[PDB]
Design a protein around this ligand. Structure first.
Ligand SMILES: NC(=O)C[C@H](N)C(=O)O
Ligand SMILES: NC(=O)C[C@H](N)C(=O)O
Ligand SMILES: NC(=O)C[C@H](N)C(=O)O
Ligand SMILES: NC(=O)C[C@H](N)C(=O)O
Lengths: 326, 312, 312, 326
């Protein structure tokens, strides 16, 4: 049976409340040892080894925990057959994409969380962790990049997002669909992401102790420019726009970001809209303003790529190329 | 034949004038006597408080002069205007908003049959007392739950939490649902003598989120801040600290979510009562902003604002 | 505390007896006084007219003896029973159906919290006069639009055309919708002295479809045949010819669709009036069968059957 | 500009009614020449050549039109750069899967239809046909198997199905998602079907003048066995069950199909449920009864594979293997 490392980071999968029934809970309060011991059947599929990297709600996920995870996976690659990462739901789609672009270990890297605390009735965490180990132990899971395994489904780290605030079925690859489905401990894979990931990206974080500063500003009717101005005034390396419709910007926000672009801030148009590409050749002249179109990457995922892009280049054309390949 | 007023505001369905739009669909004469008046001609990315105020007042004033309203509008903020009119219009005659994903000049342009189906809906008396509607892709959607789900799909508009009110086939609607939340003339919001709305801003949550956006709104003395939280409306610690402060310093704070479906609930990870925060329910950030603006024309009390978020 | 009767019928949520199921969720005592009675213990793949009849009569008879009903049932035909009870139950006290995708013995078993949420729903007086409900995956679904969308997903149950009535969080439901179609005590269907229903069969359409299934139903003298058509309820020519004949020989014919969402409409490719066929609207084949069976306890007239399909 | 053959088969894309407004229309009433001439902009992307194979509603699609299409594509492969197939919506998902298993031409084969007649306001047919030509002319569309292009999206023939009776957005790959999205005449491909198709299947129809007889029976509460009995009595080579939930059968239907199986009828459990696999190792002992599990293949698609399987073998274990690879 293969050797599988759980790296624990916290999340509701490690959460607890005073009632099995009430919705109230506090996050990252349970050790990895406890999560493992709640899944007795893990022994039938893997030799499991828990390490506790941090114990936080993923609402508090940050650059430093991203660098710690990537370096640790890359360092320990030769020491194990696979990784599972216990992690909160809230920013899982961000961590998952960061590790998909930075880890050079082509052995299965599987992220897993839970929508209901360990303490709740019909808790989802136990079977999720069982299914994440299944996936990490599966030879066919190798060379697919970093994965998220929730509700019996294997999702690629690039497309995967959380679609509902409470539903155990929340995680979906809303543009290009899942990679495979798990039934009775077995996976039928029918898809692998074409976009370049892991050992095919030039992004190497092994030496990095910080990441370029990238902010996200929201567009809506009568949008204030003040949030954009604050990011520019703090000398942010990049700004991602959560645009309306096909990545459009309220006029005030537009003007601030056009200005910033001219002083060498990187500016990526994304969209607040939950599915579909922010395209070139729409209502915005990107090449004129020195803006980048995010494609299918939602604002939080575009931040992930823009940060790593800013470690290679500050040129809008080369950042546009990066957004077309990764 | 019903009298139906088209108020035009712009969007991709049109620079093209109100009268061209109508003339492009001679079949409208089959179903209504339509008058078109131009209110603005802008991209809905540039929609604003002033246009909202113009629209509410024009529909309220002109209610008794027509049998129905169609509002031609951009797709990008259609869901914001629709909810704003939903809460401020006192006309319970049908008010139908319509747009298009493709221009008039494009292959298989959606604008024509959309406008036709939006006049069918405005001409149907069964459409009365359902609040403000969005009609797109042969579907009748309530102004509260309706949102754009895709950047380019003609089928983008969906009521993603509670579903459509009705489907249009052969110029007829089978209506099987109506919004339970209080709308139009069952709301206390009265905008007839208002010339501006409270200043409400939206800040985004993500990993390593800056508190600078939230600080810049507090520094401006914004009336309100909506959080597009992560998951069930949760806040990155820096943003949590800045909004905790905001809430006890005369800024109403609403927790919404960047997650496209489901409620931001009470009784999860956040003690709303302890911070004086309001949980948005199924209102996404831009919709929460609409209702927070209007709640602040009545009150600044976090408890009274939360009751508003529970009723409308 | 509400009195709530659980009628158990089997399914994966259970061979396990009614009283084990309850005892497995001691938290039920927090929200209701629950009595469990066993009605059958079968897989819902083996659900049948007799069980339907037992259930309608038991709920109608016992309505005045309890505050609410929960029916534990298999997932596979849950959507058929739910609609049948929706049209035949005269009790407008809450009637809630519940199942599970995973057994009691499985990791992260869904059965417990499902039963808990199904008792919350049956105990909520706001659940009254909404017709027969299905509560699965923290969602309250109307018995007419609800269907299983996935072979193994715990989130399988959806009201795919008109959306849910409400979401359950922390034992509380925000109800924002109610089915407009006539249900329970607003229907003329009365099954109290019926011991069998008319024989209705379902035939499938596809490329090169055999007419033999449809002929075997006609040869049996079936009371009715539902077509699971292709697209907008269209029929392979051989099947069209056999059902054209059926319809003028004392077999009611309903055009439904194998397509999982949308209405089978009139006024498309098929002259329903010329063939004496009925268009099912949003009723999928197995639901159309429910309503065709009950329509045939009142009438055989294709026009009167179509009016039924337009009202219920 | 590449040489693209339209093969026309009819469907609503070639349909007409007496009103642009009314929903009433008759199918397959317009010639290919007319469809081409309604899309003036086709000249900018392709040298188009129309041939009219048949003019029928796809509700009347049949084995003989399937054999005619496959042999014609395979015969003409060397004569063109790509194929588009104008076809009705109703059974497109069936034809698309049949051609995906039988055509040996690895040049783009693209199917296209329309939900609104040519005569209707905002007809979808014109832009669909433009987008199907774009896809057929795209070099990257080669070696992806047979495609369906509707509503700006490229779908693989295996997973693609129609999900709504009237909606122009109806066609979706409901299990594994689309292959790419078309914006402004350009496609970003992120997926290719893993299941074997075209020149990697052993199915060769070049000599065939008929197909094995396969029927579909529907399960529901109180299901009659009479439809199953009629198929068995007519000596059908196979029967597909549209099962309830995870491919379950009403007891009467079960008994008839178990019996048939024992006399060498092939029996495949599918599901009436619109998404998810009909799995092995559930409520049915398949190996005991000599039944086959359809996996993600809906009943009409399982008929397609079962017919072609029955041209190689009558053995339930080998048919199960075929359902695991194609
Ligand atoms: N379900 C969850 O894990 C939510 C939690 N706030 C987290 O992201 O850590
Ligand atoms: N299709 C559209 O309407 C997009 C446009 N930017 C608008 O919202 O006005
Ligand atoms: N999960 C389930 O309930 C499936 C089972 N065959 C039933 O419907 O009874
Ligand atoms: N839209 C369509 O094409 C429907 C038509 N009955 C067909 O399949 O030919």
């Amino acid at each position: 049976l293969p050797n599988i490392t759980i790296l624990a980071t916290g999340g509701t999968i490690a959460g607890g409340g005073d009632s099995a029934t009430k919705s109230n809970y506090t996050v990252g309060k349970v050790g990895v040892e406890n999560l493992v011991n709640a899944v007795p059947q893990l022994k039938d599929i893997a030799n499991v080894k828990g390490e506790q990297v941090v114990n936080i709600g993923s609402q508090d996920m940050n650059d430093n925990v991203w660098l710690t995870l990537a370096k640790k996976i890359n360092t320990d690659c030769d020491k194990t057959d696979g990784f599972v990462i216990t992690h909160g739901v809230d920013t899982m789609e961000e961590t998952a994409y960061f590790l998909d672009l930075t880890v050079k270990c082509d052995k299965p890297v599987v992220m897993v969380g839970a929508m209901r605390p360990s303490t709740s009735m019909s808790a989802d965490g136990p079977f999720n962790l069982y299914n994440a180990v299944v996936t990490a132990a599966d030879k066919a899971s190798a060379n697919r990049g970093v994965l998220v395994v929730m509700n019996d489904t294997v999702l690629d780290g690039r497309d995967v997002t959380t679609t509902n605030t409470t539903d155990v079925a929340t995680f979906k690859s809303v543009n290009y669909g899942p990679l495979g489905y798990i039934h009775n401990g077995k996976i039928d894979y029918q898809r692998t992401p074409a976009r370049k990931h892991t050992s095919d990206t030039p992004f190497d974080v092994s030496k990095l102790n910080e990441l370029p500063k990238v902010g996200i500003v929201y567009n809506y009717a009568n949008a204030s420019d003040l949030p954009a101005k604050a990011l520019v005034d703090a000398g942010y390396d990049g700004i991602v726009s959560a645009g309306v419709g096909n990545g459009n910007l309220y006029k005030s926000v537009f003007d601030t970001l056009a200005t910033a672009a001219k002083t060498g801030t990187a500016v990526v148009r994304s969209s607040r809209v939950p599915t579909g590409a922010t395209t070139q050749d729409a209502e915005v002249d990107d090449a004129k303003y020195g803006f980048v179109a995010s494609g299918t990457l939602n604002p939080q995922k575009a931040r992930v790529l823009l940060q790593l892009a800013l470690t290679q280049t500050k040129d809008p054309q080369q950042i546009q190329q990066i957004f077309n390949q990764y």
